Design a protein around this ligand. Structure first.
Ligand code: CL
Ligand code: CL
Ligand code: CL
Ligand code: CL
Lengths: 96, 276, 276, 96, 276, 96, 96, 276
């Protein structure tokens, strides 16, 4: 079955090769791609952490600056609900 | 996974070099500490050795060592020679991670997995030693030294070190980006605009807002012979027994240790191909 | 052997990806057990830890542990944290085989060869831990729990786990197909139609018929500190001393233990070729 | 003998490479191909194990439902011979 | 060296497969022996276990063991099961050589180099066990059993074993050609025409003529717990202390042993190449 | 300096690869090629070992079958000299 | 998604490959290229070491062959300054 | 780094073979010594064993051993046999370096890095043994034997050894060029015109001029169980404790030793590529 060189002359190709790992061992490509994906999701989630923080600053401002007058309590309820919404969305992303 | 790199390169219009760099930039070294052991006795892990860092006129690093007077600096060269001359000195221990694994008060790496992330670094020259020294300093830096002046000096030195380094010097690059992650996160944690907000550790960005004041347990739950600075802003991962027990257990094990200078496989040689 | 793959791909009109998948699908993990060792004392291999499995509303695994009351479930997360927090806990031991090697009451692997098939698994996250727990549960599952309800819940969970997993997650895929082999063989052994009869272990398909009642010795001959369930339908390989003595000897003699998470060699990096 | 670049300019080709083993170590390609071949032969052999089982069920039915009348004995002989034939074929495949 | 293969293929008009086979055919295994060690006690290396070899009607190997009656045969299968069931049994030790290194009464391999030529073989199946058994038998075969009848039976069995083996089964091929080298040299040494004179070990061809009767010292100089047959025609390399001391020292060393089944590196997997 | 995909679209090539060592470790290609060369020289040298053997048989025949008659001594001298010449050529090949 | 062989026939390519490292382990390509660069800079610096040596020989000649006559002192000052300049340039290359 | 080779090949008009050879020529072996150890007792590192070297009529090496009469030569073959026959003899220890690291009175390699540069050489044949013996002799050669006659004999022998060696015999080539570096530097240090001034170690070329007579401290600062010749011109690196303590510590370590004959990775085999 073998084809002799006289019928199919062999070819010899030579090169200098340089190989370098992209990542430090034992980090895998899946690990680094998963980290890049998590980081991109967490960079987007900065908006939620910032919004939660704004709610908490507003709650501090309401408590520091101040019954049958329910105005302050109505403002506190609005800030508490928005912070809860932010918190719920962040928790869903973390605890998938 | 190569199809993922191709998709990312096209979608972002980033060259394959840029797409690969974005992936490798997710890796960093953490838990930098000096290892000392007298024979087979109890080892010592010290991350507190450098109390202060300053840059000399010729852009060389100088340190105030732990226990030394406030303004008693030693050159990085003299500290490198002193360590090389100490029979107990074994080099630096470091743990390799991806940025998504650092959860501020914990690492999202099980203790038996963390065991396999440590490597021993034996600085090959002064620049290598300075990089390990700087990483360890930045991780243990308290509020008092986390100032605009320190930030400016550190960035300027990293800029000079960066220009001296090529992307094919994989280990130096790894230590350099680890310094950038720790530095920018440190600036963010002290409410100072980071030089590069892409180098703020992603869970730390979330934690500064979510754990600001009297956090609810549900938010705190997302984040949770070893000398480290308890007042070190970036060293809060050291408090965890799930971080310190694997470091000690890794050191004591009779299995040969991975050298940090060998983390990136390399081959250079001739390739001959014969076919009909 | 590459000419064999080419011939198989053409003959079956299967893509090279499909032809390679048919080859890799012959591999599975067996003999899943938790390893515990207090210092250098006698080690303990336990495959009985999970008495019952259930799927939560959000498709998360929950377990009734061995010795706990019948309806006293623990979440897989709480059991993962408990194991990670136990200093004696070393991870899971598993043996890698091809489907043709499982001969029901024995393994067609000589004891000194089996010694080289074991690896130590340190779950990297919850999904990894759940997969190892499920494999171990299925191998030790008695007749009482081998019911249509259990089969439906296990398949539904494996379906959700499978959709979360890509084929390049080689280790997760290995644990997933090992669960499919053990599950479908278990259903077949209790005279229930398997979900996929291609996942009934081939010697087990023969043994159920050939060893049904008072088999002649000639047919029986074709098949022949370690806690396993003696009533476990899929765990009959554990009875053999030619299986248990290599497990213990591997644990005490194999100096650098192979990590299950490293079973599939990977390289990712730059390739530069220079020629005239 | 060396050809300088000025006569044959060198070429530099660069790529990102990703290599992944198909099989878990220490399993070889020969092992997995041999297993795929054994499994395919054993899947075909299911017909023999099923036929043997039918002979054994028929033998149980003959013994449970029941001399100069040799009818039952003639049926038992037929079932015993077919089961023996199935057994012989299975043993030949296993003990090659 | 690839340019040498190319030159040889062209000059002899041999395909690259044939040229590579001529190179690989220079390698063989020698010094085959069974290793037994009870715990950490003194090891035992036995090359005399098989006194006689015979071929069964269905071309399966049968053995008369050492100390057993002249015509009391055991099947190769029963001897394989007995060895697998012995707790002291560790497998076969073998040394890998090139044909030019076997100098009849010595090996042209320094003792500290020979230390690195030994490997431990744990037969994966019956055929593997039979091949190791046959190699050891042939090396220790005395004049009384080196007969035309024995030669014919051995060649016929090797022919059947050869047809069952693929050139990609590197280890089986290595044991098969080692049997051909030892068999043809044995026939030559008893003044019987070898089946293939290309398989007579080259220094043995010279030694039979040069050392025939009262050789001059100048010609003799060209050639110079371990149980071997002192009357074994092909076992004269065993007499050398520069052969036996490295075997024992290799065994007693704490460095993990090379597995004979792993002598030939293999990789099978996916290759993805990304470039602009 | 980087060329974006929009200007030079990347290509992805995929293959299944099978790699097998030709020789058993730690044997190198140089070792096996050196052995093939030594074996070819030693196969040619069989003529010298055969000629030396012929001289030694002739010397035995002369000594077994048998003074001022120097005939036997003249034959023995011729056989001794030719055997010495074969021996010298073999020694030169071995002790290069 | 899979393309069957009937639509895109697979190809099998075979070769014999020979791979050899250029450098002895653990020396890296960066190490050897850094050494080649240092050596080339040091080969150029031989001119400075030779010039320094000539200054030192001239200083010895001035001291061996020999006040209001400042001639010898003026020559010594010139040789001392040139040697200092050579030394400063060598130190800058070593202590970069 | 491949782009650097390409640029260098084009800029110098050197073929890729010539460009690669210039890079590999920067590597050499230093600190050649014989290792002797009786069991687990204190090891001995001897670099003084050969007092004199001479070339026989048939261009074979002959030696006068340390302690033997001035004109009492032993053939290299007899010394090779004597060493192979000594149970305490372990081979030669050597350290691999690049030419820029040899700083005359010190090595620019930190002690913990130097630990990883040692390898154990077990000569495979006489030529290997002679090369290790010659390297060790040249490094320890005093002024009395560093004569034109010795230089001529050594070069002539190296020329004959070089013609017998192909560039694919990587280890022999490494020992050969190490002899050329040490020989040409030795000639330079005794104010004799070297055969090849490109083979004078670059820091030694500088040191001969800069440290000639009463050097200023600033110039001396650039350069700074083990038996070595204190009068050995090329052996001044041996004086450093930062050289000797790593050698002993490397030896005493229970971690398996790198073999000098394995410094250059090699693969030879079949490559099969399947694609659609
Ligand atoms: Cl680097
Ligand atoms: Cl995975
Ligand atoms: Cl094989
Ligand atoms: Cl070599």
């Amino acid at each position: 079955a073998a084809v002799p060189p006289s019928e199919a002359e062999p070819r010899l190709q030579e090169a200098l090769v340089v190989v370098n790992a992209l990542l430090p061992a034992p980090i895998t490509l899946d690990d680094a791609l998963g980290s890049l994906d998590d980081t991109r999701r967490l960079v987007k989630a900065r908006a939620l952490a910032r919004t939660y923080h704004a709610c908490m600053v507003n709650l501090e401002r309401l408590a520091r600056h101040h019954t049958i007058d329910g105005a302050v309590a109505a403002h506190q309820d609005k800030m508490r609900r928005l912070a809860d919404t932010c918190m719920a969305t962040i928790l869903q992303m973390y605890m998938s | 996974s190569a199809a993922t790199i191709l998709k990312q390169a096209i979608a972002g219009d980033r060259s394959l070099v840029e797409a690969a760099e974005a992936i490798s930039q997710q890796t960093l070294l953490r838990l930098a500490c000096e290892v000392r052991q007298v024979g087979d006795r109890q080892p010592r892990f010290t991350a507190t050795s450098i109390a202060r860092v300053d840059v000399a006129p010729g852009c060389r690093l100088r340190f105030v060592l732990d226990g030394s007077p406030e303004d008693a600096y030693v050159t990085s060269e003299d500290y490198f020679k002193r360590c090389c001359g100490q029979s107990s000195y074994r080099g630096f221990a470091v743990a390799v991670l991806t940025a998504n694994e650092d959860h501020v008060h914990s690492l999202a790496v099980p203790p038996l997995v963390l065991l396999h992330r440590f490597s021993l670094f034996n600085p090959r020259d002064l620049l290598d030693f300075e990089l390990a020294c700087l990483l360890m300093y930045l991780e243990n830096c308290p509020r008092s030294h986390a100032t605009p002046s320190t930030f400016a000096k550190v960035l300027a030195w990293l800029g000079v070190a960066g220009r001296r380094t090529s992307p094919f010097e994989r280990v130096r690059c790894l230590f350099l980006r680890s310094c950038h992650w720790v530095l920018n996160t440190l600036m963010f944690m002290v409410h100072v605009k980071p030089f590069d907000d892409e180098f703020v550790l992603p869970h730390w960005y979330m934690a500064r807002y979510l754990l600001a004041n009297n956090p609810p347990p549900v938010l705190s739950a997302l984040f949770c012979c070893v000398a480290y600075n308890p007042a070190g802003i970036m060293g809060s991962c050291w408090a965890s027994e799930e971080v310190r027990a694997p470091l000690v257990y890794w050191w004591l094990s009779e299995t040969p240790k991975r050298q940090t200078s060998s983390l990136f496989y390399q081959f250079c040689g001739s390739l001959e191909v014969l076919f009909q």
